[PDB]
Amino acid sequence: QVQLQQSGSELVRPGASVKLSCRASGYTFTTYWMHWVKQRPGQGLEWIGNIYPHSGNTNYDERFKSKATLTVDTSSSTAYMQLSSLTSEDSAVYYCTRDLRGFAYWGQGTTVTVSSPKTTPPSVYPLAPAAASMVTLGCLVKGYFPEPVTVTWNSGSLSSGVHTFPAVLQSDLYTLSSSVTVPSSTWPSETVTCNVAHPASSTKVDKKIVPR
């Protein structure tokens, strides 16, 4: 089987050269076309270019030229797809399609958000009402800058009615939601908490939910 997946890259300070590392080793070595598929959060699938290992011929496309190089090294069997002189529009999921009659062998992909930002910690605010059989719960997140965030409810014991809401953008700050439904026999009987985490700022915020 073509092992294993692609690598990860985080936000890099502007001016340095980041580098992806696409680690498909399913040899088949080394005569194929490693075409890199890139897709925005606008759900459109675009093409970043391909590379050929037997002689060394790369390619490019009009919306990603100058200077996205696709270097090849058959000793390590990796394909490099990072673009320098970048802007913030390169914040998109970056796949790795191998060559067949179609685009059959993809990778798993990585999203690389690049800017000159500041990593902000999250802050759990209690969403609790101040009557009926079941009440929906939740705790709002407001103002975390990089897209790594964590979603838990009771650390793996009340993950039934957790709806995963997107962090749509306003004022350059991500705002998602995580609402869970509780029955009246456990509220306010057991102490419910929500614990979110930010890997990029390495900050943990917790809050216990109280009836107001």
Add this chain to the structure above:
Amino acid sequence: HVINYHTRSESSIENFMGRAACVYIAQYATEKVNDELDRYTNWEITT
């Protein structure tokens, strides 16, 4: 009279149909540049 001549041998069915006629021009390569002119081409038979 005049006596006559000119047998219809080339107006036959097999003399009109039997001629090596090209039906398809298959194209392939060794290094795959794109599709088409990829290696390994194919063609379902139709005349």
